[PDB]
Amino acid sequence: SFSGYLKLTDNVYIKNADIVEEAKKVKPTVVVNAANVYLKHGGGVAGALNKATNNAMQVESDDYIATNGPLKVGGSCVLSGHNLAKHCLHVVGPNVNKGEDIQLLKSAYENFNQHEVLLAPLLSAGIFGADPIHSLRVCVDTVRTNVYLAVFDKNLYDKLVSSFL
Ligand SMILES: CNC(=O)C1C=CC(=O)N=C1
């Protein structure tokens, strides 16, 4: 199972870890991807997860988009987890660098409540431009299921734990 996580609340855990490495080690039921509406996994968590699947995640995603059209900001879809997990929950947090409404971050985290346990990144953090401290607060106040957060950056991990209310 998950190891070395610090407990923040009843159901939220956090670790300074690369989510690709965590996924390859744990092989969780669900790994969350920090997706965009097009499921174009170019950079950040999405680029890293997709590269770990040898681009199979992108091939599957393009077929999903060809059939269904784009996701909504705040929405999600369940696809295969390939070599990383049983499933990948592609969740679209608002990209504040693209002027998307930050109020959609709570709607994005609500997708996690459909899964009993998830390995996840902080939504809208990193290249999505939101304040990761705010993302963690929305996570703890929205998600009721067991979420294991992998925070790639050590310095941000330390800041998140030390400032956690
Ligand atoms: C939770 N984030 C991560 O673990 C990342 C993010 C970007 C990346 O390139 N690789 C891993």
Swiss-Prot record:
Phenotype for residue 29 to A: In strain: Mu/B.1.621
Membrane topology: Multi-pass membrane protein
Domain Macro residues, every copy: 1-165
Result, substituting residue 162 to L: In strain: Gamma/P.1
Inhibition and activation profile: Inhibited in vitro by GRL-0617.
Subcellular location: Host endoplasmic reticulum membrane
Catalytic activity: Thiol-dependent hydrolysis of ester, thioester, amide, peptide and isopeptide bonds formed by the C-terminal Gly of ubiquitin (a 76-residue protein attached to proteins as an intracellular targeting signal)
Subunit-level organization: May form homohexamers. Interacts with N protein.
Role, per record: Responsible for the cleavages located at the N-terminus of the replicase polyprotein. Participates together with nsp4 in the assembly of virally-induced cytoplasmic double-membrane vesicles necessary for viral replication. Antagonizes innate immune induction of type I interferon by blocking the phosphorylation, dimerization and subsequent nuclear translocation of host IRF3. Also prevents host NF-kappa-B signaling. In addition, PL-PRO possesses a deubiquitinating/deISGylating activity and processes both 'Lys-48'- and 'Lys-63'-linked polyubiquitin chains from cellular substrates.
Name this polypeptide is given: Papain-like protease nsp3
Covered range of the whole protein: 1027 to 1191 of 7096
